[PDB]
Design an enzyme around this catalytic site. Sequence first.
Site, short mmCIF file in Angstrom:
data_model
loop_
_atom_site.label_atom_id
_atom_site.label_comp_id
_atom_site.label_asym_id
_atom_site.label_seq_id
_atom_site.Cartn_x
_atom_site.Cartn_y
_atom_site.Cartn_z
N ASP A 120 0.83 -1.22 0.00
CA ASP A 120 0.00 0.00 0.00
C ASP A 120 0.87 1.28 0.00
O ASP A 120 0.59 2.26 0.74
CB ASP A 120 -0.97 -0.04 1.20
CG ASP A 120 -2.14 0.95 1.08
OD1 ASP A 120 -2.62 1.20 -0.05
OD2 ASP A 120 -2.54 1.49 2.12
N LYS A 122 1.90 4.70 -0.99
CA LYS A 122 1.30 5.90 -1.60
C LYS A 122 1.77 7.11 -0.80
O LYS A 122 2.33 6.96 0.31
CB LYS A 122 -0.23 5.79 -1.67
CG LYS A 122 -0.85 5.37 -0.40
CD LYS A 122 -2.32 4.96 -0.53
CE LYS A 122 -2.92 4.83 0.89
NZ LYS A 122 -4.34 4.35 0.95
N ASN A 125 1.35 7.39 2.96
CA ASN A 125 2.08 6.48 3.83
C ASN A 125 3.55 6.75 3.87
O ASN A 125 4.31 5.93 4.34
CB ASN A 125 1.81 5.04 3.37
CG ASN A 125 0.46 4.62 3.70
OD1 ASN A 125 -0.17 5.23 4.58
ND2 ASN A 125 -0.05 3.61 3.01
N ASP A 141 2.37 2.47 7.81
CA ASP A 141 1.16 1.70 7.49
C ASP A 141 1.38 0.34 6.84
O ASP A 141 1.28 0.17 5.61
CB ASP A 141 0.23 2.47 6.65
CG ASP A 141 -1.03 1.70 6.39
OD1 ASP A 141 -1.21 0.63 7.04
OD2 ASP A 141 -1.83 2.18 5.57
N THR A 158 6.22 -35.08 -8.69
CA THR A 158 5.20 -36.02 -9.22
C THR A 158 3.82 -35.39 -9.40
O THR A 158 2.91 -35.58 -8.59
CB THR A 158 5.16 -37.38 -8.52
OG1 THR A 158 4.89 -37.20 -7.12
CG2 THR A 158 6.52 -38.14 -8.76
C1 LIG Z 1 2.72 16.56 13.03
C2 LIG Z 1 2.10 16.20 11.68
N1 LIG Z 1 1.98 17.09 10.70
N2 LIG Z 1 2.29 18.28 10.72
C3 LIG Z 1 2.08 19.04 9.63
N3 LIG Z 1 2.40 20.34 9.67
N4 LIG Z 1 1.55 18.53 8.51
C4 LIG Z 1 1.76 14.90 11.31
C5 LIG Z 1 0.67 14.68 10.47
C6 LIG Z 1 0.37 13.38 10.06
C7 LIG Z 1 1.15 12.29 10.48
N5 LIG Z 1 0.78 11.08 10.03
C8 LIG Z 1 1.07 9.87 10.56
O1 LIG Z 1 1.81 9.73 11.56
N6 LIG Z 1 0.52 8.85 9.85
C9 LIG Z 1 0.55 7.51 10.13
C10 LIG Z 1 1.32 6.89 11.12
C11 LIG Z 1 1.23 5.51 11.32
C12 LIG Z 1 0.37 4.71 10.54
C13 LIG Z 1 0.24 3.30 10.71
C14 LIG Z 1 1.28 2.41 11.41
N7 LIG Z 1 -0.89 2.74 10.26
N8 LIG Z 1 -1.22 1.55 10.34
C15 LIG Z 1 -2.40 1.13 9.83
N9 LIG Z 1 -2.74 -0.14 9.87
N10 LIG Z 1 -3.25 1.96 9.27
C16 LIG Z 1 -0.40 5.34 9.56
C17 LIG Z 1 -0.31 6.72 9.36
C18 LIG Z 1 2.26 12.51 11.31
C19 LIG Z 1 2.56 13.82 11.70
#
Ligand SMILES: C/C(=N\NC(=N)N)c1ccc(NC(=O)Nc2ccc(/C(C)=N/NC(=N)N)cc2)cc1
Length: 280
Positions: A120, A122, A125, A141, A158
Amino acid sequence: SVYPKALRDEYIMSKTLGSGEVKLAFERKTCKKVAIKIISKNVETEIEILKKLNHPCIIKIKNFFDAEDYYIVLELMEGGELFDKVVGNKRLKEATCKLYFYQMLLAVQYLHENGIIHRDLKPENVLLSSQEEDCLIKITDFGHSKILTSLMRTLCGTPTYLAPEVLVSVGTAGYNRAVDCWSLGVILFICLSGYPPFSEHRTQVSLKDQITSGKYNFIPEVWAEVSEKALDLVKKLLVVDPKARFTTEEALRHPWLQDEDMKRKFQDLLSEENETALPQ
Ligand SMILES: C/C(=N\NC(=N)N)c1ccc(NC(=O)Nc2ccc(/C(C)=N/NC(=N)N)cc2)cc1
């Protein structure tokens, strides 16, 4: 409802960073910021995959709470999602594209070496370390990921009673990891051009048909900006035949990525991050 008491015990919860949802929290022990991914009720294999992987461009799990929902505690990535850098036909300097893509390649290479396919990849992620343009990226993710058989077992007879289609599948088995290289191709195309290769925007050809023919939307005016080398790599990743598609090793050997300035910047960023004493 409420956050679970075991989570509350260790963390003070705060503002939403994104959204499935990601929240800002503070670890009480350290008074440092973390991200808490809430997955409304496979997660336990995602956890087990993530626990075992150790690479600077792959996200680390800090803690896990399986309660009414699932709670995954992760390092906070201050830069947010790569998605936000490429929406609305925004696009990155080719140099920034290379630095980020190099790191994506190392991450996916490490995955594939270790028998893991992400499945996945993209822009959502791919997470950025800071709001600086030159930064570290981490892939996140792993909820669709797979560990790389019954075919191998089947081929120990076989095949007296074995069906032809099983024998036909031997020709293409073991290339499931190539789906990741395709995705990386699409992400690079987007980062370099600010638009998607395959889209239903102002075409009569179906999305499916665009993808299976491999006939991406090329707009020369948008791409006049971009080096031929960058586009050449895109072309080798967006190859329809998975046996012919570039692997991560082949991509890392491509002319576009033989860039010692880019590679130095990455090594610098790693050092900054890392930051115990050593014998000699
Ligand atoms: C502080 C911040 N952004 N500041 C900004 N000025 N844009 C953040 C915005 C989004 C952000 N996204 C994530 O951390 N995204 C994640 C993290 C973990 C995962 C995981 C492990 N998902 N697993 C799953 N099975 N869905 C998915 C998305 C981190 C920081």
